[PDB]
């Protein structure tokens, strides 16, 4: 979409190519390509691509990339604003006037800062127009000497012999909302004779701020547990007696789609019984959506507190810093400990292809003033986070069996993802068993695997993804 | 407080304030008074004030009061960007430059749109200077007799004998994002002798699409029905049975909270059981969470659908609307249709203090082209709503008893709320009713309403509510 072309008006100029800045800039291209295949050489890790359009046949592609890109152009219209607007500030016009950071309530009223002329002084008359197209202009007080034209219109003039007055006049000025919309902007004309500046007036409620009374850190108080369980009830229950061997009294919601449920309770134990294999993501929304506190840890069902599962280290992150989750690390019964610090990034494709996921192990850069902490995009199943931000990106109902990662690539770039390594829980090593396992582990040709393409396709306009 | 008073440099103007535009304004002055008591009058609606401060002891008051304030100081933090800033464009500047609209995913790279110096045709040498804090200059190629002192660094000098050379170059300058954040600005700084010029590239990933597959309108593939029930199984079934009368394959999601569940199971019906008195957004926000269609349609256990309840209707609007949420009416046996149509507004308050709620019956203006149809900010608890909205929004599930604007409160502004006179359902008109009504029915100064207070005054920052 760049085409660094030469306008003809500065065609005879000589450039050279930075073949190295060129190359940083988006060319909407990608593709994803995998490794050599073969046995692997020490310093190389392996990548893989997958192709998603491989997850439907022919005719089921082209009718999903049509259907895919109609509802992303009925997303973009209901997401996009006159804000968003690329704007270019005139040089050399005698028009001063605010450039960002103006905004109103819908249906409310402003004085608008920093409108003014520059002009020279000595002119018989200094006109200047305002237009707005969701609002109306007014002036909080008449200037003696200025003639005012469209006062509570959409059209203002602003008409005197004195340039002081007509300044004075500015500082005056008021904009009102006239029409109801939620989240939007009005791009305002101010204008004199030969000269027109564009500008924007924000017009948005201000956001919920959703504060939580905080009651060092009760951890009752702050911290639901949350966690999904399916037919390993042995292993509940160990978790939730390690949970209480450190926390007494914070709240443990469960989520359970077993068949034939048994029956959890204890004190501060809240258990959810589902429709019988509504699935993993179902669950864990479920779980979130009962959380009153103003953080949740997830657990998986399989985990084991030890003495260094110190919860309130994680507090202090999210209590001191700007992060929305951090994780911490499991340790499996094999002494090795893993944070599961993932890089997520989508890469411009070709229209109507969709673009390229690229998810790579690794962080951004290391946390200031909390050693063995860093930012990335994503990390293992146990972590603190705001629950307000949890449920702002969800856990897709729709990813029944097996995902991770797609949660925090719904979250990208909505989600402050962190990842803390002192922080550690352990991981656990008849009928319900072999179940357990073909739910647990189908064919990677399953119709779930195909289905998890197909979805991930669609949501969020991929045509391939590489795994590293 | 906006400033009306004259600065020194004007103090000499005289100015008549405008006393009707001046009462536009915010002047972080609000309170809440009841109209006066007494037998009502025919055209004046009774406005009663609620005062959230007296729902604390005086000396807890004072506690909440500061860890109040503390937390919105700490969410303002988090929240706020160099985009928030006012910035003012300087007047007779020769720098033009992007005012609005320049945007680049973190750690990517840009040509930035629209720098030149507009100056003198033949002078002694051009100088223009960029400055970032979050990236680093570069150019897309060099051009011939343009010298460049810091490309790959924050500060990036240009400086050519030829304008039209150095106006080329600008046209080449690319912005690159050094460090890694999710959503924030850096206010750059373009200056030349004598001028100086800030504006903003806003530093963000694009939004999570969240498109959904298409797998006249199909209802089942489209619409999930949900809802929560409490000892009512008679109204419920009675509510599945008329369901099925019109809607024989949509999904009907049910949350329950009752102590000794019945089962309810039908085809394509979902059964949720909850810890017993969990409550009633608790359950709302579990229903939601298990959605996995593009619209979800709220109905209470008590509804009833007759030939009137045309969800068709209703996925019509919002297919052909940017509505995230549209109400329809409930009729009472009484033959009385509600579509409760409200309007909610926050007006500024005394710092510290809080702010104060205004609700009042009506609706802001007709939704163009759907006669019977209208926009507002909450309506009565038969909707259909995009689910995601309605995910991000949440029914607060410390709301454990009776609730129903606080919904509409925690989305004003990120909701777009429509209301359709025309679809219409019906509502239906022992031990387990005594037990009902002791849940639905406590005193208005029961801890339930009390705790509400509290809540609604911590987390909205309200000191005071009006209702109409
Ligand atoms: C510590 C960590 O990062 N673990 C992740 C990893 O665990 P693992 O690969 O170790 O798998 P696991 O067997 O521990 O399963 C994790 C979770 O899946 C749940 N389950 C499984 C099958 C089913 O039909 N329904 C259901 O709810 C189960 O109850 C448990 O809490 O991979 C899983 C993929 O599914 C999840 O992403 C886990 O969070
Ligand atoms: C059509 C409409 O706008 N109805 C609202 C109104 O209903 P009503 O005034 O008709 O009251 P209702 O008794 O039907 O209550 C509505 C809902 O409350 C639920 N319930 C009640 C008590 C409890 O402890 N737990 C629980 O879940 C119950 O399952 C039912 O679906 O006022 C309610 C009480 O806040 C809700 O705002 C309703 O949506
Ligand atoms: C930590 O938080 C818990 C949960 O909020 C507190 O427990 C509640 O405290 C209130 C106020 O004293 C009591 O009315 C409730 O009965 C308690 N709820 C339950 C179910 O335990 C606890 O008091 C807090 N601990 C400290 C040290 O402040
Ligand atoms: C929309 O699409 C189709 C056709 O309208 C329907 O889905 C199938 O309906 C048959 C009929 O009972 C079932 O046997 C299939 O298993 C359905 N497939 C599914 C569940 O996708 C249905 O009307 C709508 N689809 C959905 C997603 O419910
Ligand atoms: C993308 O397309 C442009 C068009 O010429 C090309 O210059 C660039 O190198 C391409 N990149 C890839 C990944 O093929
Ligand atoms: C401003 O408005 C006046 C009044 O309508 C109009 O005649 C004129 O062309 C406009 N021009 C300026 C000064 O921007
Ligand atoms: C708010 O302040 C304005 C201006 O200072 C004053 O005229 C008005 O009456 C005040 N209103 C209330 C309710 O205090
Ligand atoms: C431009 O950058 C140079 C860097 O050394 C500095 O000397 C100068 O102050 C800057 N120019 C202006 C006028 O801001
Ligand atoms: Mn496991
Ligand atoms: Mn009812």
Redesign the pocket.
Known sequence: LPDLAPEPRYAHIPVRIKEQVVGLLAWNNCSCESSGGGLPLPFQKQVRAIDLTKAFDPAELRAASATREQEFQAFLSRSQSPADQLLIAPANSPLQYPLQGVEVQPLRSILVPGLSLQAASGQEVYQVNLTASLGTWDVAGEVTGVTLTGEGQADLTLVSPGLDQLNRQLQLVTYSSRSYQTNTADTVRFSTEGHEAAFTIRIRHPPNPRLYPPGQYNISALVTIA??????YDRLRALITSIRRFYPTVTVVIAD?SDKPERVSGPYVEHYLMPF?K??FA?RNLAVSQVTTKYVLWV????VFTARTRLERLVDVLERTPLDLVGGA?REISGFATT?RQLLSVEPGAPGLGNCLRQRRGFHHELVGFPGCVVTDGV???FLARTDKVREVGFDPRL?????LEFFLDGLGSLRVGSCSDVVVD?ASDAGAET?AR??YPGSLDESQMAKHRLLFFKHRLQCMTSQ
Do not use: C, M, Q
């Not at 966690?227 to 390993?232: D, H, Y």
């Not at 029944?400 to 991770?404: K, T, W």
């Open positions: 966690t999904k369980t399916f037919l390993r789609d294999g699935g993993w669950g998986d069902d399989d985990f499991v599961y293992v199943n146990f029944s069996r097996v995902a991770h991981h357990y739910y647990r």
